[PDB]
């Protein structure tokens, strides 16, 4: 994977590629790596696919119950704390590498979490196999006081660096923008720069090409 997070004027933006691998094989060409913990707290995940999905849902579930209990909108630090303590408890065996971001009554926030349970704070972050390609772009073009449109451009450019240069990353760019005082906008397939070209030939077979031994109607009804 390649995943990034970038802070800006009135909030924070996160982005991700959409490749899912199985050894050298691309298993999913358009998988969703951006996860909703709460309405305005989102999470980008790299590493073991099942672990990132499972850990983000569990903490997301507990955050919802906590929000209902306290009659308050959830905070990013609460998700950050719950995730890191869970991951730490499992001593890195839950292979989830996360970029946690969001807006809450305290303000806008951007964090990263590693599988062993260590957390980092920053204005720009990148995780995954293509993090070096992405971080190169972020280190080259990032500045203080980014606008919304500039942060989206920088974030997607950092993901693109991963898509093109890292074999672990590819396909499309997902984005999620979390601005203060507004609803978070999830931009699924924000960029699609890897569309499959028209095939040279149609491989539609003449009906009856396949040799059949038996036929039977299957009963699905009661």
């Amino acid at each position: 994977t390649t995943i990034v997070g970038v802070k800006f004027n009135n909030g924070v933006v996160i982005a991700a590629d959409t490749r899912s691998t199985q050894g050298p094989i691309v298993a999913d060409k358009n998988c969703a790596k951006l996860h909703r913990i709460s309405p305005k707290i989102w999470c980008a995940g790299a590493g073991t696919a099942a672990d990132t999905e499972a850990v983000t849902q569990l903490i997301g579930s507990n955050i919802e119950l906590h929000s209902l209990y306290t009659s308050r909108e959830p905070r990013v630090v609460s998700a950050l704390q719950m995730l890191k303590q869970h991951l730490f408890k499992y001593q890195g065996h839950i292979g989830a590498y996360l970029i946690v971001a969001g807006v809450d009554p305290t303000g806008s926030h951007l964090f990263s979490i590693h599988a062993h349970g260590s957390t980092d704070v920053g204005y720009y972050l990148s995780l995954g196999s293509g993090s070096l390609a992405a971080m190169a772009v972020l280190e080259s073009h990032w500045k203080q006081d980014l606008t919304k449109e500039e942060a989206i451009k920088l974030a997607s450019d950092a993901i693109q660096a991963g898509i093109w240069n890292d074999l672990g990353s590819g396909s499309n760019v997902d984005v999620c923008v979390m601005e203060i005082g507004k609803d978070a906008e999830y931009l699924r397939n924000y960029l699609t720069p890897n569309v499959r070209e028209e095939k040279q030939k149609s491989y539609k077979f003449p009906r009856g090409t396949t040799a059949v031994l038996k036929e039977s109607i299957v009963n699905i009804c009661d």
Binding site: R19, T21, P24, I25, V26, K29, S129, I163, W164, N165, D166, L167, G168, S169, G170, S171, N194, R196, E197, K199, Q200, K201, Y203, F205, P206, R207, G208, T209, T210, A211, V212
Partner: protein, 222 residues
């Protein structure tokens, strides 16, 4: 401990027609999750209407091609400029490969050209020199993806004549150079989609009695 081998990825493909033969191969070169070159050719004209490719560990691949090219040169010197036939080249390559039986060239070698009756010929080699003439062969990282597709579309495997109750097989016939290039292009675009080590560019070398022609096509760069 020092490991003398490496995996440079990529994949190659050879198809034989009636009066021609093609040897295709992607131009991507990699190590681990990094791209080394987007255009590094590994299909070579070796003279006497023989095209060759040795896919796998590029250092061993280049060494082999280099030695075979040199073998063709000395064959002319020692035998009054006699043309090296594709069958003779194949046997010569077996001895090159098996000469390092106890420290092998880590490559899948394919050569293509015309036999002494003017008909299309493709030979394929394992790393230690076992070889076989075939109408069809894929080699390298995406061989397991491409090869069954070739069995179906070149040799018409598992295809029966419609309405014959799976009793009459689809009759074998030679393909035109136009139809073969369609299959090569579709094979590589498919392989590019689902294999991370395959992409960037496709280079095809076509061999007829007139000589060796080249064709190049763009592939996805993610």
């Amino acid at each position: 401990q020092f490991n003398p081998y490496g995996d440079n990825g990529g994949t190659i493909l050879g198809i034989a027609g009636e009066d021609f033969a093609v040897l295709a191969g992607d131009t991507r070169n990699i190590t681990d999750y990094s791209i080394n070159s987007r255009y590094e050719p590994k299909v070579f004209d070796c003279g006497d209407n023989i095209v060759m490719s040795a896919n796998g560990f590029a250092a061993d691949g280049d060494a082999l091609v280099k030695r075979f090219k040199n073998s063709v040169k000395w064959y002319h010197f020692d035998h009054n400029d006699k043309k090296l036939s594709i069958n003779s080249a194949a046997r010569n390559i077996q001895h090159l490969l098996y000469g390092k039986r106890f420290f092998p060239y880590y490559v899948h070698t394919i050569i293509a050209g015309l036999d002494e009756d003017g008909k299309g010929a493709v030979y394929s080699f394992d790393p230690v020199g076992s070889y076989e003439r075939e109408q069809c062969r894929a080699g390298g990282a995406a061989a397991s993806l491409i090869m069954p597709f070739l069995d179906n579309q070149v040799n018409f495997k598992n295809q029966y004549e419609p309405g014959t109750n799976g009793k009459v097989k689809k009759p074998l016939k030679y393909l035109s150079v136009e139809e073969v290039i369609k299959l090569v292009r579709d094979s590589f675009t498919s392989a590019t989609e689902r294999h991370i080590q395959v992409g960037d560019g496709l280079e095809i070398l076509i061999v007829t009695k007139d000589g060796v022609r080249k064709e190049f096509y763009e592939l996805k760069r993610d």
